Amino acid sequence: AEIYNKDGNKVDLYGKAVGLHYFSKGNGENSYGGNGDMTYARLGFKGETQINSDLTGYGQWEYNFQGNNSEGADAQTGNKTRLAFAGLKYADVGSFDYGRNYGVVYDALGYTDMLPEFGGDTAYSDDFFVGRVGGVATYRNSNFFGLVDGLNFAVQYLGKNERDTARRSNGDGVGGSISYEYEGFGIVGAYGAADRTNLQEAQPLGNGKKAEQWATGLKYDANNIYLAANYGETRNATPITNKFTNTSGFANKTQDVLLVAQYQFDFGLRPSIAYTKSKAKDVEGIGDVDLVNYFEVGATYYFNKNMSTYVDYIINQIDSDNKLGVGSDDTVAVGIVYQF
Protein backbone atom coordinates (compact mmCIF):
# COMPACT_ATOMS: atom_id res chain seq x y z
CA ALA A 1 0.00 0.00 0.00
CA GLU A 2 1.38 3.41 -0.88
CA ILE A 3 1.61 4.96 2.54
CA TYR A 4 3.76 7.91 1.46
CA ASN A 5 4.10 10.20 -1.51
CA LYS A 6 5.43 13.72 -1.20
CA ASP A 7 8.22 15.68 -2.85
CA GLY A 8 8.73 13.13 -5.59
CA ASN A 9 9.26 10.31 -3.13
CA LYS A 10 6.74 7.55 -2.79
CA VAL A 11 6.97 4.65 -0.39
CA ASP A 12 4.88 1.57 -0.68
CA LEU A 13 4.78 -0.51 2.53
CA TYR A 14 3.40 -3.93 1.68
CA GLY A 15 2.78 -7.28 3.31
CA LYS A 16 0.56 -10.26 3.84
CA ALA A 17 -0.64 -12.72 6.45
CA VAL A 18 -1.09 -16.18 4.97
CA GLY A 19 -3.01 -18.81 6.96
CA LEU A 20 -1.75 -21.99 5.29
CA HIS A 21 -2.01 -25.75 5.80
CA TYR A 22 -0.59 -28.74 3.91
CA PHE A 23 -2.32 -32.11 3.82
CA SER A 24 -0.18 -35.14 2.90
CA LYS A 25 -0.40 -38.67 4.28
CA GLY A 26 2.03 -40.11 6.80
CA ASN A 27 4.50 -37.71 8.37
CA GLY A 28 4.61 -36.00 5.00
CA GLU A 29 8.23 -37.18 4.91
CA ASN A 30 7.56 -39.07 1.65
CA SER A 31 5.07 -36.56 0.22
CA TYR A 32 5.67 -33.75 -2.24
CA GLY A 33 5.24 -30.71 0.00
CA GLY A 34 5.10 -31.99 3.56
CA ASN A 35 2.19 -31.77 5.96
CA GLY A 36 0.87 -29.45 8.64
CA ASP A 37 0.69 -25.73 9.45
CA MET A 38 2.69 -23.58 7.05
CA THR A 39 1.33 -20.18 8.07
CA TYR A 40 3.59 -17.16 7.39
CA ALA A 41 3.68 -13.43 6.81
CA ARG A 42 5.68 -11.04 4.66
CA LEU A 43 6.64 -7.42 5.19
CA GLY A 44 8.58 -5.27 2.76
CA PHE A 45 8.97 -1.81 1.32
CA LYS A 46 9.49 -0.49 -2.23
CA GLY A 47 10.63 3.12 -2.53
CA GLU A 48 11.03 5.27 -5.62
CA THR A 49 12.21 8.85 -5.87
CA GLN A 50 12.21 11.13 -8.91
CA ILE A 51 15.59 12.79 -8.89
CA ASN A 52 14.51 14.69 -12.03
CA SER A 53 12.59 13.91 -15.23
CA ASP A 54 14.95 11.22 -16.58
CA LEU A 55 16.41 9.89 -13.35
CA THR A 56 14.71 7.67 -10.79
CA GLY A 57 16.27 6.08 -7.73
CA TYR A 58 14.60 3.19 -5.99
CA GLY A 59 15.06 0.53 -3.36
CA GLN A 60 13.33 -2.53 -2.03
CA TRP A 61 13.44 -4.84 0.96
CA GLU A 62 11.24 -7.84 1.67
CA TYR A 63 11.26 -10.15 4.65
CA ASN A 64 9.75 -13.51 5.49
CA PHE A 65 8.36 -14.18 9.00
CA GLN A 66 7.34 -17.84 9.56
CA GLY A 67 4.00 -18.17 11.39
CA ASN A 68 4.35 -21.85 12.24
CA ASN A 69 7.17 -21.77 14.83
CA SER A 70 6.74 -21.65 18.61
CA GLU A 71 7.70 -18.66 20.73
CA GLY A 72 10.41 -20.93 22.07
CA ALA A 73 13.89 -21.71 20.74
CA ASP A 74 12.68 -22.51 17.23
CA ALA A 75 10.98 -19.10 16.93
CA GLN A 76 13.26 -17.88 14.04
CA THR A 77 13.16 -21.00 11.89
CA GLY A 78 12.66 -19.99 8.27
CA ASN A 79 12.86 -16.22 8.76
CA LYS A 80 14.91 -14.37 6.21
CA THR A 81 15.34 -11.37 4.02
CA ARG A 82 14.25 -12.29 0.51
CA LEU A 83 15.27 -9.10 -1.34
CA ALA A 84 17.44 -6.08 -0.46
CA PHE A 85 18.67 -3.75 -3.20
CA ALA A 86 18.96 -0.15 -4.37
CA GLY A 87 19.31 1.25 -7.88
CA LEU A 88 18.81 3.99 -10.49
CA LYS A 89 16.88 4.14 -13.77
CA TYR A 90 17.90 6.70 -16.32
CA ALA A 91 15.75 7.80 -19.22
CA ASP A 92 15.90 5.15 -21.97
CA VAL A 93 19.46 4.18 -21.09
CA GLY A 94 18.46 1.47 -18.64
CA SER A 95 18.45 0.62 -14.95
CA PHE A 96 21.12 -0.65 -12.66
CA ASP A 97 20.80 -2.12 -9.19
CA TYR A 98 22.84 -4.08 -6.68
CA GLY A 99 22.02 -6.25 -3.68
CA ARG A 100 20.07 -9.43 -3.01
CA ASN A 101 17.79 -9.86 -5.99
CA TYR A 102 16.60 -12.39 -8.59
CA GLY A 103 19.14 -14.09 -10.88
CA VAL A 104 18.68 -13.36 -14.62
CA VAL A 105 17.67 -16.91 -15.54
CA TYR A 106 14.55 -16.27 -13.47
CA ASP A 107 13.64 -13.75 -16.22
CA ALA A 108 12.68 -16.96 -17.95
CA LEU A 109 11.49 -19.25 -15.14
CA GLY A 110 9.16 -16.55 -14.00
CA TYR A 111 6.83 -17.51 -16.88
CA THR A 112 5.56 -20.64 -15.16
CA ASP A 113 6.06 -19.61 -11.52
CA MET A 114 2.36 -18.87 -11.27
CA LEU A 115 0.81 -21.76 -9.33
CA PRO A 116 -1.43 -20.91 -6.30
CA GLU A 117 0.96 -22.46 -3.75
CA PHE A 118 3.51 -24.75 -5.50
CA GLY A 119 5.28 -24.62 -8.89
CA GLY A 120 8.51 -22.87 -9.85
CA ASP A 121 10.43 -25.94 -8.67
CA THR A 122 13.60 -25.16 -10.54
CA ALA A 123 13.89 -21.57 -9.29
CA TYR A 124 15.95 -22.44 -6.14
CA SER A 125 17.31 -19.84 -3.74
CA ASP A 126 21.04 -19.11 -3.45
CA ASP A 127 21.55 -21.29 -6.47
CA PHE A 128 23.46 -19.13 -8.96
CA PHE A 129 21.13 -17.38 -11.46
CA VAL A 130 17.78 -19.18 -11.10
CA GLY A 131 16.26 -17.59 -7.97
CA ARG A 132 17.13 -14.98 -5.32
CA VAL A 133 20.88 -14.62 -4.69
CA GLY A 134 23.10 -12.18 -2.88
CA GLY A 135 25.58 -9.75 -4.37
CA VAL A 136 24.30 -9.42 -7.91
CA ALA A 137 24.74 -6.25 -9.98
CA THR A 138 22.04 -6.09 -12.67
CA TYR A 139 21.73 -3.85 -15.72
CA ARG A 140 18.43 -3.93 -17.58
CA ASN A 141 17.39 -2.34 -20.81
CA SER A 142 13.86 -1.76 -22.04
CA ASN A 143 12.75 -1.32 -25.63
CA PHE A 144 16.32 -1.42 -26.87
CA PHE A 145 17.26 2.11 -25.73
CA GLY A 146 13.75 3.08 -26.75
CA LEU A 147 14.40 2.21 -30.36
CA VAL A 148 12.63 -1.18 -30.45
CA ASP A 149 9.29 -1.54 -28.63
CA GLY A 150 9.10 -4.84 -26.77
CA LEU A 151 12.73 -5.85 -27.00
CA ASN A 152 14.50 -5.94 -23.62
CA PHE A 153 17.69 -7.41 -22.30
CA ALA A 154 19.70 -7.68 -19.16
CA VAL A 155 23.21 -8.63 -18.12
CA GLN A 156 24.08 -9.58 -14.59
CA TYR A 157 27.31 -9.87 -12.63
CA LEU A 158 27.31 -12.25 -9.71
CA GLY A 159 30.01 -11.80 -7.12
CA LYS A 160 31.61 -14.69 -5.27
CA ASN A 161 29.71 -15.80 -2.14
CA GLU A 162 31.73 -18.21 -0.05
CA ARG A 163 29.30 -19.37 2.59
CA ASP A 164 29.76 -22.13 5.18
CA THR A 165 27.68 -24.35 2.92
CA ALA A 166 28.25 -25.74 -0.55
CA ARG A 167 24.53 -25.35 -1.29
CA ARG A 168 24.40 -21.64 -0.49
CA SER A 169 27.75 -20.73 -2.09
CA ASN A 170 28.92 -19.48 -5.52
CA GLY A 171 31.97 -18.11 -7.33
CA ASP A 172 31.99 -15.19 -9.80
CA GLY A 173 29.89 -15.39 -12.94
CA VAL A 174 27.97 -13.45 -15.57
CA GLY A 175 24.56 -14.01 -17.05
CA GLY A 176 22.12 -12.29 -19.38
CA SER A 177 18.65 -12.56 -20.85
CA ILE A 178 16.90 -11.27 -23.95
CA SER A 179 13.14 -11.27 -24.23
CA TYR A 180 10.58 -9.95 -26.66
CA GLU A 181 6.97 -9.15 -26.11
CA TYR A 182 4.44 -8.54 -28.80
CA GLU A 183 0.77 -8.26 -28.05
CA GLY A 184 0.04 -10.94 -25.49
CA PHE A 185 3.00 -12.99 -26.63
CA GLY A 186 6.33 -13.10 -24.97
CA ILE A 187 9.45 -15.11 -25.61
CA VAL A 188 12.58 -15.14 -23.49
CA GLY A 189 16.04 -16.62 -23.51
CA ALA A 190 18.31 -16.55 -20.45
CA TYR A 191 21.75 -17.90 -19.65
CA GLY A 192 24.44 -17.65 -17.00
CA ALA A 193 27.70 -19.43 -16.08
CA ALA A 194 29.76 -19.07 -12.91
CA ASP A 195 32.67 -20.48 -10.99
CA ARG A 196 32.00 -23.14 -8.35
CA THR A 197 33.74 -22.72 -5.00
CA ASN A 198 36.32 -25.11 -3.48
CA LEU A 199 33.68 -26.46 -1.09
CA GLN A 200 31.22 -26.99 -3.92
CA GLU A 201 33.88 -28.99 -5.68
CA ALA A 202 34.65 -31.00 -2.55
CA GLN A 203 31.11 -32.39 -2.68
CA PRO A 204 30.32 -36.07 -3.36
CA LEU A 205 27.77 -35.44 -6.17
CA GLY A 206 28.48 -33.46 -9.37
CA ASN A 207 31.79 -32.80 -11.20
CA GLY A 208 33.13 -29.61 -12.79
CA LYS A 209 34.67 -26.21 -12.05
CA LYS A 210 31.91 -24.16 -13.65
CA ALA A 211 28.13 -23.99 -13.18
CA GLU A 212 25.67 -23.30 -16.03
CA GLN A 213 21.97 -22.66 -16.31
CA TRP A 214 19.84 -21.58 -19.29
CA ALA A 215 16.10 -21.60 -19.86
CA THR A 216 13.81 -20.41 -22.58
CA GLY A 217 10.21 -19.50 -22.11
CA LEU A 218 7.14 -18.83 -24.17
CA LYS A 219 3.86 -17.35 -23.13
CA TYR A 220 0.48 -16.09 -24.22
CA ASP A 221 -0.85 -13.63 -21.69
CA ALA A 222 -4.10 -11.91 -22.68
CA ASN A 223 -7.89 -12.29 -22.75
CA ASN A 224 -8.12 -13.81 -19.28
CA ILE A 225 -5.92 -16.59 -20.52
CA TYR A 226 -2.46 -17.47 -19.30
CA LEU A 227 -0.51 -20.22 -20.97
CA ALA A 228 3.21 -20.52 -20.43
CA ALA A 229 5.99 -23.01 -20.96
CA ASN A 230 9.62 -23.22 -19.95
CA TYR A 231 12.43 -25.54 -20.94
CA GLY A 232 15.92 -25.24 -19.57
CA GLU A 233 18.97 -27.25 -18.60
CA THR A 234 21.79 -27.01 -16.11
CA ARG A 235 25.25 -28.44 -15.47
CA ASN A 236 26.52 -28.89 -11.92
CA ALA A 237 24.09 -26.27 -10.67
CA THR A 238 20.96 -28.02 -9.36
CA PRO A 239 21.35 -29.21 -5.77
CA ILE A 240 20.38 -32.83 -5.01
CA THR A 241 20.65 -35.18 -2.00
CA ASN A 242 20.70 -38.94 -1.82
CA LYS A 243 18.35 -39.57 1.12
CA PHE A 244 19.67 -43.12 1.40
CA THR A 245 23.35 -42.31 1.66
CA ASN A 246 22.65 -38.84 3.00
CA THR A 247 25.01 -37.66 0.32
CA SER A 248 24.80 -34.26 -1.32
CA GLY A 249 26.02 -32.18 -4.18
CA PHE A 250 24.82 -30.98 -7.55
CA ALA A 251 23.33 -32.74 -10.56
CA ASN A 252 25.88 -33.06 -13.32
CA LYS A 253 23.03 -32.34 -15.73
CA THR A 254 19.29 -31.61 -15.73
CA GLN A 255 16.61 -31.05 -18.32
CA ASP A 256 13.65 -29.17 -17.01
CA VAL A 257 10.15 -28.68 -18.37
CA LEU A 258 7.30 -26.65 -16.96
CA LEU A 259 3.90 -25.90 -18.50
CA VAL A 260 1.04 -23.87 -17.05
CA ALA A 261 -2.45 -23.04 -18.24
CA GLN A 262 -4.83 -20.90 -16.25
CA TYR A 263 -7.92 -18.80 -16.88
CA GLN A 264 -9.27 -15.88 -14.93
CA PHE A 265 -13.04 -15.80 -14.72
CA ASP A 266 -14.64 -12.44 -14.28
CA PHE A 267 -16.19 -13.41 -10.95
CA GLY A 268 -12.86 -14.10 -9.22
CA LEU A 269 -12.13 -17.77 -9.81
CA ARG A 270 -8.79 -18.62 -11.43
CA PRO A 271 -8.38 -22.34 -12.16
CA SER A 272 -4.90 -23.73 -12.76
CA ILE A 273 -3.53 -26.73 -14.55
CA ALA A 274 0.23 -27.39 -14.65
CA TYR A 275 2.84 -30.02 -15.35
CA THR A 276 6.40 -30.10 -14.07
CA LYS A 277 9.27 -32.47 -14.61
CA SER A 278 12.93 -32.04 -13.78
CA LYS A 279 15.20 -34.99 -14.42
CA ALA A 280 18.84 -35.29 -13.51
CA LYS A 281 21.29 -37.08 -15.79
CA ASP A 282 24.54 -38.85 -14.94
CA VAL A 283 24.13 -38.53 -11.20
CA GLU A 284 27.29 -40.17 -9.86
CA GLY A 285 26.00 -43.57 -8.85
CA ILE A 286 22.32 -43.52 -9.83
CA GLY A 287 22.37 -42.69 -13.53
CA ASP A 288 19.22 -40.81 -14.58
CA VAL A 289 16.75 -39.85 -11.80
CA ASP A 290 13.65 -37.65 -11.72
CA LEU A 291 13.84 -34.88 -9.16
CA VAL A 292 10.40 -33.37 -9.77
CA ASN A 293 7.50 -34.89 -11.64
CA TYR A 294 3.83 -34.12 -11.14
CA PHE A 295 0.58 -32.62 -12.38
CA GLU A 296 -1.06 -29.80 -10.52
CA VAL A 297 -4.69 -28.87 -10.39
CA GLY A 298 -5.68 -25.92 -8.32
CA ALA A 299 -7.73 -22.81 -8.02
CA THR A 300 -7.56 -19.36 -6.50
CA TYR A 301 -10.55 -17.26 -5.73
CA TYR A 302 -10.06 -13.55 -5.42
CA PHE A 303 -12.54 -11.84 -3.17
CA ASN A 304 -10.85 -8.59 -4.22
CA LYS A 305 -7.26 -7.28 -4.49
CA ASN A 306 -6.64 -7.76 -0.77
CA MET A 307 -8.26 -11.08 -0.04
CA SER A 308 -8.12 -14.49 -1.60
CA THR A 309 -8.10 -18.24 -0.84
CA TYR A 310 -6.93 -21.25 -2.80
CA VAL A 311 -6.38 -24.98 -2.90
CA ASP A 312 -3.39 -26.32 -4.72
CA TYR A 313 -3.30 -30.04 -5.35
CA ILE A 314 -0.13 -31.87 -6.43
CA ILE A 315 -0.62 -35.22 -8.18
CA ASN A 316 2.85 -36.54 -7.74
CA GLN A 317 4.10 -38.71 -10.61
CA ILE A 318 7.34 -39.51 -8.84
CA ASP A 319 7.44 -43.24 -8.10
CA SER A 320 8.16 -44.99 -4.81
CA ASP A 321 11.31 -46.58 -6.26
CA ASN A 322 12.94 -43.22 -7.02
CA LYS A 323 16.70 -43.70 -6.56
CA LEU A 324 17.40 -40.49 -4.63
CA GLY A 325 14.61 -40.87 -2.11
CA VAL A 326 12.52 -38.08 -3.58
CA GLY A 327 9.02 -38.34 -2.09
CA SER A 328 6.16 -39.87 -4.11
CA ASP A 329 3.05 -38.87 -2.13
CA ASP A 330 0.51 -36.21 -3.07
CA THR A 331 0.05 -32.91 -1.24
CA VAL A 332 -2.92 -30.56 -0.97
CA ALA A 333 -2.43 -26.98 0.21
CA VAL A 334 -5.24 -24.78 1.43
CA GLY A 335 -4.69 -21.17 2.22
CA ILE A 336 -6.27 -17.91 3.10
CA VAL A 337 -4.47 -14.70 2.24
CA TYR A 338 -4.90 -11.11 3.38
CA GLN A 339 -2.55 -8.61 1.83
CA PHE A 340 -1.86 -4.95 1.35
Residues that bind ligand C8E (CB under 6 A): 19, 21, 98, 137, 157-159, 172, 174, 334, 336
Q: What is the DSSP string of 52-80?
A: SSSEEEEEEEEEEEESSS-SSTTTTTT-E
54 binds, among a copy of itself, ligand C8E, none (CB under 5 to 8 A by kind): none
d(CA 195, CA 55): 35
From the CB of 222, what's the least distance to ligand C8E, in Å? 32
Of residues 37 and 149, the one with the C-beta less far from ligand C8E = 37
Rg of the chain over all Cα atoms, to the nearest angstrom? 21
- By CB under 8 A, what part of segment 46-75 binds a copy of itself? 47, 49, 51, 55, 57-61, 63-75
Of residues 75 and 315, the one with the C-beta less far from a copy of itself = 75
d(CA 253, CA 221): 31
Quick one: which of 24, 32, 97, 232 contacts a copy of itself (CB under 8 A)? 97
218 binds, among ligand C8E, a copy of itself, none (CB under 5 to 8 A by kind): none
Helices (H), 102-164: 106-109, 143-146
Closest CA to 278 of 32, 100, 53: 32
d(CA 128, CA 139): 17
| Span from 7-15, 110-118, 193-201, 277-285 in contact with a copy of itself (CB under 8 A) | 7-15
Of residues 59 and 159, the one with the C-beta less far from ligand C8E = 159
- Does 218 contact a copy of itself by CB under 8 A? no
Q: E-assigned strands of 164-252?
A: 173-182, 185-195, 210-222, 225-235, 239-242, 247-250
| Span from 94-102, 110-118, 218-226, 259-267 in contact with a copy of itself (CB under 8 A) | 94-102
